[PDB]
Amino acid sequence: GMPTINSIQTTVNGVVKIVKPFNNDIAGEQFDPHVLQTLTAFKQPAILENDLAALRSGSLTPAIADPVGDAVTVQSRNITALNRTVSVEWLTPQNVINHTVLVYFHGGAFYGGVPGNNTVLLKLVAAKSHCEILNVDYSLAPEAPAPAGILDGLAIFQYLEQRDAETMITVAGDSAGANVIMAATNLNQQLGSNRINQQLLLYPVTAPNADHAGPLWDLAAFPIIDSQRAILTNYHDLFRQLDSIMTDYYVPENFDSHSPLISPLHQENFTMTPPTTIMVGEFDPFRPQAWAYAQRLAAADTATTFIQYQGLNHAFAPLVDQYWQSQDVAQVMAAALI
Amino acid sequence: YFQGMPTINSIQTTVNGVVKIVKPFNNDIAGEQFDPHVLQTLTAFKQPAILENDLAALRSGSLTPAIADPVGDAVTVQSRNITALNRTVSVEWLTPQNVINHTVLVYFHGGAFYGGVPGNNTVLLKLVAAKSHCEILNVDYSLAPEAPAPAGILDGLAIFQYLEQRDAETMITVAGDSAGANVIMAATNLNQQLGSNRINQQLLLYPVTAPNADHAGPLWDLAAFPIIDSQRAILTNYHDLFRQLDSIMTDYYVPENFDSHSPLISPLHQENFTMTPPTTIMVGEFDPFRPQAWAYAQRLAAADTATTFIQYQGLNHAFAPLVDQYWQSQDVAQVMAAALI
């Protein structure tokens, strides 16, 4: 049972902006109470240690309650293209429609995470939209740093395009997975493929290791009530630390994080970029760079929708058994596919 | 730790010197029902379970299916043999990228004395290594009935000697789950009786402290597990399965010349607990072995040994390796890592 929320839709700089409050009494500037109860640790500041294994040990989401069950089949398979073998968690709903497929890259700061972290979210989407979904186990840094994950995405696309000449691909992902999928999409387009007709981006990293004293990383953009301000500061500060650490893992010495294929925000042209829906929390430290990305698309005359979830932080979407806003994301995506 | 998980409000009390930490499965429910994630795995227990009493089936049922591994190559996993006391014992050796000196973790997997493999808890241990920067011996110890008691025990002894002769400064933490915990506890006891003091800690995950205890006695009384009416049948059937399993496994473990009530088969029945190292026990509310674990913790505390007893509400037996299934499993990893640094 989901709430009846009065969202606010405006158009800012060509971007369709949809702001969804966490309830009908509070319009912004505080955490959703469900979220807040998870942030207790952020009463104190955190020092991110910077070792691979410790970082990875926090990137495993325990099984999310699964209401879909047998109505969607989840199986592993390997696909091969461009001399790359990439493992995918393949989701198949009942009564599959053709010529629409969703490719999804999980988050995990380029070095971690597992596709299982968002299986249940994707089962919701496949069940509603009757579309098959590729939940991809893409290459991870630093063992397989950039552009390994990108090339995996390219192989997946080639595979899909050669399998069927009529199937339309929607690319999606959360956080750093979205970043990688966006680059792969760019690369796919620069080779002449037009089969990717849509991006669904959940709080994407669009500018890894951006200036932490610049406007993309400025706490002044996150007004919040006094009692939650220390928590917000420490929370934002943790991600500031992560942003540096993760980009170091992702980018090898020969490459640079400010390049277009590492930072989609810095692409020189956005005219080939497909129609895009971005979903992100009010208090996600990556929110500003997501918004900057959206503005860039709209200015290039690409249809762009930016849904902001008030009171929400980073990485919330797969937690469909915790937040109505997660179920909402599931709905938005499904709707985008049918 | 990282991201989405509501803070659990645990309850710490001291009972007869035991530091008791009760961790509810959410902030709504305090006790007396299964955590729903556990509950959905217990459907078959609406009816009495059928145990196939043959070695091949029992062994097969002691093998955990693949668990998702978020660590990958960031912790090194090697097979090595060590030899001591004229025993060669295989170990899965876990090495993190920056290793702290001296502190080392020896772990014995569960599997009812006749079964299990170190691979059952590899991911759990990679988590522990990753957080603690400690090297870990995940030991392939002797299994019954081909190598019944005290073969596993002696394998433990051999490991300790290997480690202590390797360097004199190294501190050992012994750990294991279920029957694995039992065997490594006895080996620790033995190691101490020979005069070693290098083992400075036990981390026990739902240990079997008294194999084949009286099933009509207080350690096996269903009354000790209050639960809601809707889940009573399941609990009862689940508990009965383990009662039967307890008899069978002890039979395999204990050869005819020995006895299960002895101190080295049943650490609960040690005559003395004063050499016993500081200990942390982690066990589920609905683990059939919970009461015997509690009895052990009390004997420790009474011997003025620091004892912590973490009870995870709504959890059953053998949950810990399942780190992709239960937040409590990752919590166990965290508690262990904390105890090592």
Residue numbers in the entry:
A (entry chain B): 0 to 337
B (entry chain A): -3 to 337
Show the paper's wording.
The protein belongs to the αβ-hydrolase superfamily and is related to the bacterial hormone-sensitive lipase (HSL) family of enzymes as concluded from structural similarity searches with DALI. Here, we present the crystal structure of the carboxylesterase LpEst1 from L. plantarum WCFS1 at 2.05 Å resolution. This structure revealed that although LpEst1 belongs to the bacterial HSL family of enzymes, as otherwise expected from its sequence, it represents a novel topological variant due to the presence of large and specific structural features that decorate a canonical αβhydrolase core. Additionally, the esterase forms dimers in the crystal and in solution through an association mode not observed yet in any other αβhydrolase enzyme. The structural homology found with enzymes from the bacterial HSL family permitted the straightforward identification of the catalytic machinery of LpEst1 as a classical catalytic triad with Ser174 as the nucleophile, His313 as the general base that deprotonates the serine hydroxyl and Asp283 as the residue that increases the pKa of the histidine imidazole ring.
The four independent molecules of the LpEst1 asymmetric unit are arranged in two identical dimers, consisting of the pairs A–C and B–D. The independent molecules are almost perfectly superimposable with an overall rmsd value of 0.42 Å as determined with PDBeFOLD. According to the analyses with PISA and PIC servers, the subunits within each dimer generate an interface area of 1130 Å2 and interact via 19 hydrogen bonds and 24 hydrophobic interactions. In summary, taken as a whole, these results demonstrate that LpEst1 is a dimer despite the relative low overall interaction energies calculated at the interface and further suggest, that the apolar interactions are the main driving force for dimerization.
